[PDB]
Structure 1
Amino acid sequence: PVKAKCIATLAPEPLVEHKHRTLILHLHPDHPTLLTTRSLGSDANPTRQWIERPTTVNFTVTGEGLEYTWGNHPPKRVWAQESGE
């Protein structure tokens, strides 16, 4: 057994949607995709869920940031400061 880099997986890109300190994400994979995040406060408040059924989800993003992992697609990151004026 060797450390080959398999030609490997990739899940379709997400639909990013803005709200006030909140990411609505209409999402639509090919296969069951383990999504997960890390609210970068010292309060981690992570989430995990395999997604195979297309699902609009939500994420209470904080002031300092959140990150977002659409499958083995690379991890995203997001500034959600205010939007409530």
Structure 2
Amino acid sequence: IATLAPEPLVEHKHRTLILHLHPDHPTLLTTRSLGSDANPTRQWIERPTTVN
């Protein structure tokens, strides 16, 4: 029986995800821009943060 972080707040912009975000605990977020240019990102988020 395991973890789960509160859902994100998806916000639209022009080819851009603003994401007001607000976890319970430090959450490792990460992505993969699916181009052959990967351009991934990693950051533990414990403090609520609007990201892009």
**In 2, distance between residues paired with 1:22 and 1:40?**
15
Displacement over 3 Å in runs of 4+: none
2:36 maps to 1:42: yes
Shift of 1:31: 0.0
What is the RMSD computed on CA atoms of the aligned residues?
Answer: 0.0
Q: Number of aligned residue pairs: give it.
A: 52
Q: TM-score, normalized by length of structure 1?
A: 0.61
Match of 2:26 among 29, 32, 35: 32
- Greater per-residue strand proportion: 2
User: Equivalent pairs: percent with the same residue?
Assistant: 100
- Which structure is higher in RCO with an 8 Å CA cutoff and minimum separation 6? 2
Unpaired runs of 5+ in structure 2?
Answer: none
Larger Rg: 1
Q: TM-score, normalized by length of structure 2?
A: 1.00
* Cα offsets for 1:20-49 (capped at 9, x unmatched): 000000000000000000000000000000
